Amino acid sequence: DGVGNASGDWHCDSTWMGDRVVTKSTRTWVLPSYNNHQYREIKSGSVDGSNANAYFGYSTPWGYFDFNRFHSHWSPRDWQRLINNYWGFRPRSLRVKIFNIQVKEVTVQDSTTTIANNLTSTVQVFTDDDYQLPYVVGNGTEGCLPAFPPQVFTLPQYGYATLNRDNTENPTERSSFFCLEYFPSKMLRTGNNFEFTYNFEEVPFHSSFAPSQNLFKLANPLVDQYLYRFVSTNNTGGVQFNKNLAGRYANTYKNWFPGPMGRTQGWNLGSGVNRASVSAFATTNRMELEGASYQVPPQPNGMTNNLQGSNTYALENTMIFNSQPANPGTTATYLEGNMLITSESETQPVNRVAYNVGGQMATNNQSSTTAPATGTYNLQEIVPGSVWMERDVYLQGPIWAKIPETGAHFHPSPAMGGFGLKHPPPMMLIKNTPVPGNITSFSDVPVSSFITQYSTGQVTVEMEWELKKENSKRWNPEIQYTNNYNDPQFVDFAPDSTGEYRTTRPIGTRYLTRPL
Amino acid sequence: DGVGNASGDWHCDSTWMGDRVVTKSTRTWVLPSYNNHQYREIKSGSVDGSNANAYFGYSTPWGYFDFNRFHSHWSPRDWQRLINNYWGFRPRSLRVKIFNIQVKEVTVQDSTTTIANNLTSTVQVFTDDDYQLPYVVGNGTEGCLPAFPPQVFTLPQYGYATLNRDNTENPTERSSFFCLEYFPSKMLRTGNNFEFTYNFEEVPFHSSFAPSQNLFKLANPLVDQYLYRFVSTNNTGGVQFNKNLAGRYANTYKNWFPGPMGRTQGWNLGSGVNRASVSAFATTNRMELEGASYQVPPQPNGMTNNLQGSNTYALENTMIFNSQPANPGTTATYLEGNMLITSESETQPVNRVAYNVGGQMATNNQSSTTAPATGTYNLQEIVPGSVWMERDVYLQGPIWAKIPETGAHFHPSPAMGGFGLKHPPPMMLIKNTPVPGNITSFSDVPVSSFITQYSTGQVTVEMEWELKKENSKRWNPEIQYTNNYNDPQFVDFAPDSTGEYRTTRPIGTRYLTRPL
Amino acid sequence: DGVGNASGDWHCDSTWMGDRVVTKSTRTWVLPSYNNHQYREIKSGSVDGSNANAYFGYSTPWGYFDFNRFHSHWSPRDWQRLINNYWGFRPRSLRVKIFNIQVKEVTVQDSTTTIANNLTSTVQVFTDDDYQLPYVVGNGTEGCLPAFPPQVFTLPQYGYATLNRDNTENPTERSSFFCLEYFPSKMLRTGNNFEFTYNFEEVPFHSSFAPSQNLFKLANPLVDQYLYRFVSTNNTGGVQFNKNLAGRYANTYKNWFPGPMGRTQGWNLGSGVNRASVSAFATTNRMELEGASYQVPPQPNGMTNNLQGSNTYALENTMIFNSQPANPGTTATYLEGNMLITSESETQPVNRVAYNVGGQMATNNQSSTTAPATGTYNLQEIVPGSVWMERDVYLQGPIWAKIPETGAHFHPSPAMGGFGLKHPPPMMLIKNTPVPGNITSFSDVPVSSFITQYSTGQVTVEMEWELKKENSKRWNPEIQYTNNYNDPQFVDFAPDSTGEYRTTRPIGTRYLTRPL
């Protein structure tokens, strides 16, 4: 519309209406003119002693809007209301608006650097609706809408890795270059705005409850089974049997089995002792791909990284967040007191402990001359009649991930937790349209000098979430997430004396309980 | 209709119409009177040092029409048009016609053997629509419609193995005998024809594209993750963490995992060195069934048998064709220069290398007195969040396979590649109706002398295929299958000076690329 | 409309719809105020030892939009899709939009030079619909829309040569001066835009296929002709004849002849030896006009500048591009490794080799006392029953050329390749409207001082192309353009580490084959 007329209003709120909740989040963003308006082939050979760090790709002059983290939409109090009252939830729709665009021109005349807004300049915006570009959004990276509403953020630069040759920095003939200008996009001057709507595909509810029963003890403890078990052989070798008694869950016949597991080194936190001076990398779990070895945190779903009351943690099977955002590219050493370390203990009644053996199988054929032998295993995958709980989601964790397009997959549930989608919210890309400097003579060579500038504006994201009601008959009170602190010096989830947002703990989702 | 009137015309063609393509193939066939009009119990004990070669079954006087190979329908040029332009395809319908039947009577009078056509003789034809007979068609056997249209072929004899006892040649009380005359069938004299139509069940498109991205490096290489990792313990044992940086794909948290794998010995081709004088059989991968050991080429889907640029091949995880048809029952030794050896390298960005370890797990519990230990594994099956590409299909490979009827299975994708069907094109059986010789006296004993004869005619198969369009935004050119030869002495996919059809290479399907 | 409202969006895309394809290209342009708002008579005498370099003309303060190069509309991948699947194509319509205009005023106050946009300034635009101005667009000059979308370009200055006297720098009484202000034009301020539509006249499809047969061997090689030939005279002089046999293509009677030819010196590239220290100019092909000698590359259509597999090139009958844009007016020496040298070998089955003799004629009257004599010719023009292929078009080559208006011409097919048009896309001219500086006193003398400024904006061009489908019955696979590189260090047709667009090869159009 015009220079002196706002193109949108500030919407931040949450509205609960029975079985649905609508969250609205608005934030102020800033967008730098990355790579000075050009694409740059980027790459890397081995780094830190691993050719898995090798890659070939491109960086683009584009930035993107990422809102794939629960805290970008949920305030702590709203998150508490959710996890303390519902058995599950799931996203249904999404609406995004970008408005109140302002383009500023920066000039360093004799070192006084003045910032003046350029009224006739534009930004370009488009969404990759058909997923024709590498989808970098569901990979746990930085640059999402901030958790605290007043915080202004910088949009991350869009870049991607394509195929690299023989674990080197070189491309292959199958490496692909994607040109973002080769998509239609809207051009906005200061009076214009941009809007976009989307609907999520049908996905299962996240399970925000914890088993109030152990998978191996579903049988009635007051009744014996009508099934018997082999317990030994007489002095001759004639097999003998005993009836499985009531309560003897060690022997009861079972219908269902725990989820798959892959042993993951257990470490001790707080008041726990560990092997000193160890360098983690060499003994970490790995998976080989294209002739290289990669660490695969947090490991496939199916296990619990820690037992309730225990201080042992299968750290590679854990989601570990920082209690605050850190500078980019830092190599500083962090200790437990600076980290938000999550625990999947709610799942222990059905998910196997990650730092223990999964079980044992028979390793030979017994005979009059050979005693039966057994052997433990450190990994077991999916078997029929298997059941397990997916990783929990957290206020500071990711919401969804794109299921890779290959034509085949099994149980597309994202390892980092959340919702696996075939058609996730599309990439929303934006960039500052280049404005050429004083060019006075012709040349068939592409212009190189550009007036330096950056853009800023607001962004609103509104999401509707469907809720699954709690229909429990438990008589005694349940566990609830509570604001429990002792002799506080500050309020958690609030700005400090300097205005920095403080969050001392990760908030999961499983407080309510349900029997199996 | 009549003796002097043709009962069908020659249809060989292909018609492309947007999202569909219709292929038509006609061929001349010849049918011998197998087993001289009788069923013969067939069997075998151990052979070549393996009781897995033992079997019990029957051979029948029937022949069958098999057209379960891509080249029976696709000409090389049409195959090239397909693989260079589409992201996938799948069969939709099938129509078969058998016509222009001619029955010839052979007589060896004093060794002059004259061939005269018997106008009053018939052939019988029927299709096993309800799958009540052993389905032998999707098992990589010979006798399919020839790839080159002018070639006349012999119909293979129908036979099957039922249950054999304790890996011997003896039957069991559960062994079943199937009598093909116990089905209704059409009888055709020289003026008659036979027609049949069929529709394929809904099946997924074959993926005829290659990942242009590595499964473990989907993250944006310009942005760090907001997740941290355990990297070591201080001189006391207090765990320490580091932020996962941009591009360090060796450490990035991952959402998805590669497909399942089972280590398969890697061998070298061409300019590669191998252990000399080895006898393959003993160290080949195996699976036990009913007290016996079987080789299971080409292994379950999920792996790549070779890396791009590498000359190493997990030969037991490879589809190996001959560059021409060989005589039946040959035991000649073949070298690489006579074989069409396929490579699944297009899948390397998501399928694990078959001749390498899959990865490593933790093998103990670390402690102040014990350093953490890890151990590699040679096989890992399906885990949640797993993704992979099925084996590719080839111009000379099979199209479909029947899913065994057992009431339980997982991801029915045929190991040899193609489409797994519950109700595949039915067996189309045909045989020469017996004509008794000069019988002059009665006997309650079944007649044994029969006028010797064989039949010949044409067969047409028409298939409609649905195509999935390529919707790519890749800027730079893609790889395409091309007729690239240097200083040729002959044209590949053409008859030679003697008329024999020459095919020097296997043509896969994955040339186009798509990001993940 | 207004200052803070965009007047157009970014459209870059391609849409294939059966027999048509629509390409859209948008680019950012910059326009200098050429000649400081005035016309300048320009001229030149002899230069480099040639009075053909003499000319008389004018330079104007106008710039023009040129999009007469295939790569301005086709991306490499789209070009590959075109040439690998169609037998021909042709342009049908064109739509152009100029928008998001920004006019900047430059001021050098004490050497700090500030750039500020002048909101009340205009640019003027008009198209020469009636072709009343010299048409400079179809002459292989620089300044066309860039091949790579993100590249910003400078608009070339409009100028033309009229008639010069006796190969000197002087005008003639017939020399004409054209004043561009003497045309109606639109004036646009920052909120305005300009649009224009055009339809191409009916033109033949470009032939994007290659003959799979030799023009002189169309006869059936298994059958003799019923025509005979004179082969000699007996010892007396009585003529003798022989029947033309099957396959003897050297003697067969022919119905059709190759295209016209004019011998062009052949040079060797790569591993080929050439006469050293030669200065090309003196022995180059020429044509005389108005008392002067001109080089006429790439020579009239009808010949092939090179044979398949041969390293010899009739360089003056070749289109030679640079693998990147070079500065204006450069006199640097370029070697083969920096050039994109094209080859017309696809046409060799019908176009005569340019560096060979065309053939030979009889040069005398034989007699009992004089043996028959023959003589080779170095040039032969059009004869009845002549057939040939026009020059191929290239991704980096021109699309069309204006047919000179003289009232007479033959086969208006542009030597540089492309489409010869009588009414081609009109010249689209634009310039910065002059803004006078501080003038304080009257004078009948035309104002000379002007506020210095330049303009910038976007330009979109959309073209619809009609396609001719490939209807081939060739059995074996065809040749296809493919992204085939060995051990690449960079991706061709992609920006390098510095962002510069790299194109290492010229892509022609003739990959598919058709018989004659």
Author numbering:
A (entry chain A), B (entry chain A), C (entry chain A): 209 to 724
Which of the paper's sentences describe this entry?
Adeno-Associated Virus (AAV) is a small (~25 nm diameter) non-enveloped single-stranded DNA virus in the Parvoviridae family (genus Dependoparvovirus). The icosahedral proteinaceous shell is composed of three capsid proteins. These proteins (named VP1, VP2 and VP3) share an open reading frame and differ only in their N-terminal residues. We use a high resolution (2.5 Å) cryo-EM structure to analyze details of the molecular interactions that are presumed to be key to efficient infection and are likely to be relevant to serotype-specific tissue tropism.
Gold standard Fourier shell correlation (FSC) curves indicated that a 2.5 Å structure was obtained for the receptor bound dataset and a 2.1 Å structure was obtained for the native virus. These are the highest resolutions achieved for AAV5 structures to date. When comparing both of the reconstructions, there was almost no change in the viral structure upon binding AAVR. Following least-squares superposition, agreement of the new complex structure with the prior structure is reasonable, and excellent compared with the uncomplexed AAV5 structure at 2.1 Å resolution. With high resolution structures of both complex and native virus, interactions can be analyzed at the atomic level.
